[PDB]
Symmetry: C4
Subunit: 355 residues, 4 copies
C-alpha cells in the first residue's frame, strides 16, 4: 500500500521467452493438425534456443567483474538451456524430442529473485515439515487402513485392498472430493466426520508452516535489502539505535523509470518518499529537482492536504516510501528531527515555487 513498483519488474527477455516458447509445445501434441504451423514453431524453439544461445556465450564471457563470484546458480541452466534440446534433437528422432521442453521452465527461475527467498527458509523449518510429513502418513495409514476393514466384502472392485483406500483417503483428507468410489454403509461413512476435521486442521497447521516465517523472511526482506540506503541519507547520524528497527520493517524501496509520474498533484497526499539516487520532475514554476538523497511529502502530511506538485520521474530513481503514522512515529520519536521537517515544511512552501 505504500510503494510505487515500476520499471518492468518482469524485465529480462531471458524470462519473457520461456512463456511463448512452451506454448510452442502443445500444437505438436494434437492429431488432425496441419504441418504448416507444426514446424513454424519448431523454429521458434530454435529462435529461443538460438536467442538464449546468442545470449549464452556473452554470459560465458565471465571475465567481467571476475574477482569473487558464485555463479553456479546463474549458469546451472544456461549450460542445459541449449544442450538438452540439442541431444534431444537427434537421439529422439520422433517428434517427442519436444518433450524436453521441460527445460526452459527453470529459465524464469534463473532470475527469479524471490525463489532463493523460497528455498532459504525450508532449511530452517523443514524439521517441522518432516514430523508433520510423517504425521500426515501417520494419520494417513492409521485411518486409510480403517476402510479395508469393512467394504472388502461388497466392494472388492473398489475397496478390495489397502492402497485403493489410501487413494480415497487423501482425496477424502485433502479437501478434494473427486467422487469416483464412495462407501455405502453407516460406520464407514461415520469415519469421515473426523477426516475433514483432521485434514483441514493438519494443513491448518502444515500449510501454515510456510507463511509463518516466510512472512518473517519477506518482512525481513524489507530490512536486509534496506539497511542499505541508510547512511546515504545525510541526516541519519542522529537516529537512535532502536529507532531503525521500529521503522525499517515498514520501509520498502523500489525503482521508478524515467518519464513516469511519482505523485500527481491534487490527488490525496497519503505518503512521503525518501530519494537516495536519481532525479525527479517536481512540477512547479521553478522545478525543485532534487537529486540523490532527498525527500518530499511532509508538506502534505503535516497539513493532511493534497499534493503540492505533480512530482514525476525525470530519471530512473531508487525510491523509498513511507506513510504518515510511521512518519508521525518519527515526528513523535524525536523533537530534534521534527524541527527540521518543520523548517522544511516552511522552506518548501517558498522553495517549491521559488528557486
Amino acid at each position: 500500500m505504500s510503494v510505487l513498483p515500476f520499471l518492468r519488474i518482469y524485465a529480462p527477455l531471458n524470462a519473457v521467452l520461456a512463456a511463448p516458447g512452451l506454448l510452442a509445445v502443445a500444437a505438436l501434441t494434437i492429431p488432425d493438425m496441419s504441418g504448416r504451423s507444426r514446424l513454424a514453431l519448431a523454429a521458434l524453439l530454435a529462435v529461443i534456443w538460438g536467442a538464449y544461445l546468442l545470449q549464452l556465450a556473452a554470459t560465458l564471457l565471465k571475465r567481467r567483474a571476475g574477482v569473487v563470484r558464485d555463479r553456479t546458480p546463474k549458469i546451472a541452466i544456461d549450460v542445459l538451456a541449449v544442450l538438452v534440446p540439442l541431444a534431444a534433437f537427434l537421439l529422439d528422432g520422433s517428434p517427442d524430442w519436444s518433450l524436453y521442453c521441460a527445460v526452459w521452465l527453470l529459465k524464469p527461475l534463473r532470475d527469479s529473485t524471490f525463489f532463493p527467498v523460497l528455498g532459504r527458509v525450508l532449511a530452517n523449518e523443514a524439521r517441522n515439515l518432516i514430523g508433520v510429513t510423517t504425521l500426515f502418513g501417520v494419520v494417513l495409514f492409521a485411518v486409510a487402513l480403517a476402510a479395508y476393514v469393512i467394504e472388502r466384502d461388497i466392494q472388492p472392485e473398489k475397496f478390495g485392498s489397502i492402497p485403493q483406500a489410501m487413494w480415497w483417503a487423501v482425496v477424502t483428507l485433502s479437501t478434494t472430493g473427486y467422487g469416483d468410489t464412495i462407501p455405502q454403509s453407516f460406520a464407514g461413512r461415520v469415519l469421515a466426520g473426523a477426516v475433514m476435521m483432521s485434514g483441514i486442521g493438519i494443513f491448518g497447521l502444515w500449510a501454515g508452516i510456510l507463511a509463518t516465517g516466510f512472512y518473517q523472511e519477506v518482512r525481513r526482506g524489507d530490512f536486509v535489502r534496506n539497511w542499505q540506503l541508510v547512511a546515504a541519507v545525510p541526516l541519519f547520524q542522529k537516529l537512535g539505535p532502536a529507532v531503525l528497527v521500529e521503522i525499517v520493517r515498514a520501509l520498502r524501496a523500489r525503482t521508478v523509470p524515467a518519464g513516469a509520474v511519482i505523485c500527481r498533484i491534487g490527488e490525496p497526499g497519503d505518503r512521503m518518499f525518501f530519494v537516495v539516487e536519481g532525479s525527479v520532475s517536481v512540477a512547479t514554476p521553478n522545478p525543485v529537482e532534487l537529486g540523490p538523497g532527498a525527500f518530499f511529502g511532509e508538506m502534505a502530511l503535516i497539513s493532511g492536504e493534497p499534493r503540492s506538485a505533480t512530482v514525476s520521474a525525470a530519471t530512473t530513481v531508487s525510491l523509498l516510501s513511507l506513510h504518515s503514522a510511521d512518519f508521525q512515529m518519527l515526528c513523535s520519536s524525536s523533537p530534534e528531527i521534527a524541527e527540521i521537517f518543520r523548517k522544511t515544511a516552511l522552506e518548501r512552501r517558498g522553495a517549491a515555487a521559488s528557486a
Copy 2:
C-alpha cells in the same frame, strides 16, 4: 468487538438499486415465460436507468465545492451508467441487449470504500504475486506435463494431449475435485500425493499474501482515519509521543444515528467511548447531555460494574470506542491522566444525577 456501527453503512440508494436491477435480468433468460412481467421489469431498468439518470445530471453539476477534486473515479461509471444500456437498446435489437446489465455491477463499487483499500495494496505486494503466479505456472506445467507421459495409450479420449491434463491439474491442485476424468494406473495416482500437498501449501502462501498486509492496511485503516478526532479532545496536549501508536491501533470510530441507544443501563459495562461530535441522551433524572468532545464509561470500568445510564443517541454522533485494557493501558500509561479520570469518576457520580 469494541464498536457500535449504525446509521445504514449500506446507505446510498445508488448502491441499493443495483441489487434489484440485476435480478431483473434472469426472468428474460428463461423459456416458457409470459410476456407480462417480462417487460414489467424491463421498465425497472428504465427506472434505475432513469433514477441514476435522474441522479446523474445533479452529479454533473460539479460546481459545488469545485476547488480541487479528483472525480475520475466517482464519474467513470455514471457516464457509462446510462450510455451502455442506451446504445445497447438499439443496436442489440434482440432481447440480448439486457446482457449489458454487466454495467451496474460497478455502481456498488462506486461508493464502495474498502475497494480502494483493496487495490491500494496490490501495487506493493504484486511483486510477490507475480513470482508466485509464475511459480504457479512453474508447478503447473512441470507437473501437468507429467500425466501426458503415461495414459496417452489407454486414455487418448481424456489424456490424449497436454492441456487436457493441465485442466485436471489445477482441478487436482486447486483443492477442487470435479470428478470427470481420473487415471487408472498406479504411478499416475502416485503423483497426486505431492499435489494437494503442494497446492494447499502454495495457496497456503499465495492466498496468505492478501491478508498479510491487507490486515496491515485495515489495521492501518484504524489509524489513518483516526489520527483525526485527536486534537478535538481538549485533553490530548499532554499525551506522550509514542503513547498514541500504542493506542490508536485499537481505536475505531463509527457513527450512530439519532434516537438509537448507545449503552443501555444495567447491561455489563464492557467499554467506554470518546464523543467528539454530536449529542447524547444520558438517561438520568437530570440528563447529562454532553456534546462534541466528551466521554463516558470510566464510571463502570474503574469499578467493573454495569452501566450507570441508558446512554442513547439523541443526535447523529461521531463516536469513538475503547475497552478497558487499552484504557487500563492509559490509566497505567500516566499518573497525570488517571488523576482527572479519578475525579471524573467522582464528579459523574454526583453530576450524573445532579445537573
Copy 3:
C-alpha cells in the same frame, strides 16, 4: 500449552441432554421400523422436556439475587424450550411434530460462553464482511454471467440460463467441485484458471476476517477475565504500570476440581502457577498446603529441574498458570521482585519438607 483445564467444562446437564435428545429424532425418520423403540424415545423427549421443564420453574424463581440482571438471553429459549414442542404436539397430529426438535439446538448455546464472544466481534468487522459480501456477489455475477455467453447453444439442458451457472460458479469458486455439469469447450474452460485463483484469495481474505480480531478477542479474553485475580495477590502493589499488559496476555486462569493432580512429582518442571482461591495437596512429609493467594514452581524453574512435589488438587481451586520465559520476563523485569523469589526459592527448599 500452559493451562490445566479440569472440572467438566461441559458441565451443565442442560447442555448435556440436547445431545441424546436429538438422536431421538432420526429413528422416527425411517421406514421399515418397529413401533417399539419408536415411541420409547418419544418419551425421552418428554423426559428432556419434563427435565428442562423440571429445571424451568426453578429458573422462573428469579427472585434469587434479584437486584440488577439482564436475563433475556438466558431465558429466551427456556420459554420456548417447552412451549414449541407442546403446541407442536397437538396441531401437528402427524408424527412430523418432532420436526420441532430444531429447538433444543440453542440449549447448548444457552450456556455457551464463547458464543457471546462470537457475536461480539461481528458488530465491529461486518463493515468489511458486507463490502466483501457484495464483492463476493460482484465477482459472482461478473463471472457467473460469463458462461451463459457460450454453452447455451450445445448445453441448453445444463447451461440454458443464468442461475444454472451461478450454481456452477460458487461450486467452481468455493473450492468445491461437485462434478455434475462441466463445460466442453476451450474458452469456457480457460475461464476457471482465475476462479480458484480468486475464491481462495477471496476467502483467503474473507475467512481471514474472522480469525483476525477474533484472536484479538480471545487474546483479549485472556485479559478481560484476568485483570481480575490481580489485587488478590498481596505482592502486586509494586508491579509497574505497563508491566501487566506485557504479562497478562499470556496468563490464563482455569479451575481444577478437588482430588485431582496439579503437578506430579518428577515429571519435567515446565510451568509455575499462582493460586488465588482454594487449597492444594503439596506432596511433602509436612504438606505445605497453601490456600488462597499463593504460587509454586520457582523451585523448579530457577533451577530448571523436575518437580519437588506431587502437588494435587485438595479442593476446587481457581488457578492461574505461567511458563518460564514470561516469569523469566518477570525475573528480568524487576530486581525488587526476584529478591523474594530467590528467598522463596530457599524458603521452600526447607519449608517444603519442614512445616
Copy 4:
C-alpha cells in the same frame, strides 16, 4: 532461514524401520500374487520385530541413569511393539494377523519430539475446540435438517431421511464436493449459498485455532530449548534483563555433524553463529579453530561482505545462528557490546590469517 539443520534429524533406526515394515503389508492384501515374496516380507516383520525386539531388552535395562525418570511414554509401545504381533501370530491363524501392523505406526511417534509439542497445547485451547465442535454440530443439524424438508417427495432414494443429508451436509460444508447425490430444485440449491460461506468461515476459525498458539508454542520452542546455551557464553553477564526476550525469539540452535561445511567462503555473508560446544575448521592459512563458546560472522556483517573463511564442521558442534538485523539489534542495543565486536572485527582480520 537462519539455521543449518544437519546430522540426520530423522536419525534413529527405530523410526526408520516402521516405514519399510508397513509396505510389507500391502502385497499380502492382493489376489493373483505368488507365495514367493508373500512370505519373504513376512520375515521382514520378523526382522523388524526381532530388531526392535533386539533393541528391546537393552531398553528394559533401565538401570542406566536410574535416578529420576518418567519412561511410561518411551516404553508404552515397546511393550506392545512385540506382543501385539505375537498373540496376533497365533490367535489369528488366517493371514489377517498382519492387520496388527497398525502397531508400528506409533514407533515413529515414539521418538517424535514435536508430537508432545502437539498434544501439549490441546489441553489449553480445546475449550475453544469444544464450543466450536458443538457449534459445528449446531450448524450441522440446524442446516442438515433443512434438506429433509424438501426432496423427500421426489428423492426418497437419496434424501429420504435425515442422516442421508447430514452426509451431504458435511460434504457440502467441508469444502469437499463428492458429487454422488445433489438436489434438483431451486430453494434447496438456494441453501448452499451460505454453506460454503459458513464452513470456510468455521474452519476459517477452527483450523485457525491450531496454528494460533501452536505457533506460540513453536515460537516458544525457540526459547524453552534456548534459554539454555546462554550462561555458557562468557559475555552474557552484562546483557540487560529484557534484552534476551527481544533476541531469543529469533535464535534457534541446531547441531551440525563432523566433516560438514558451516559457511563456505565467498558465498554471501548473510548470518553469524554462536558456537557453544564442539570445534570447527575455519579455513585459513593458520586455522583459527575455536572450540566451545565462540562465534563468527561479524567480520562479514559489519562490512556486509562475503565470507572470510570456508568455516566447516570439524566435529559435531552445537550451533546457534543469527542474521544481521537481530545482531544489528544487538549492536544497537548496547554501546558496551559493540566495542568488543568492533575489536573482534579487527582482531579476526589479523587473527584469521595469523595464529
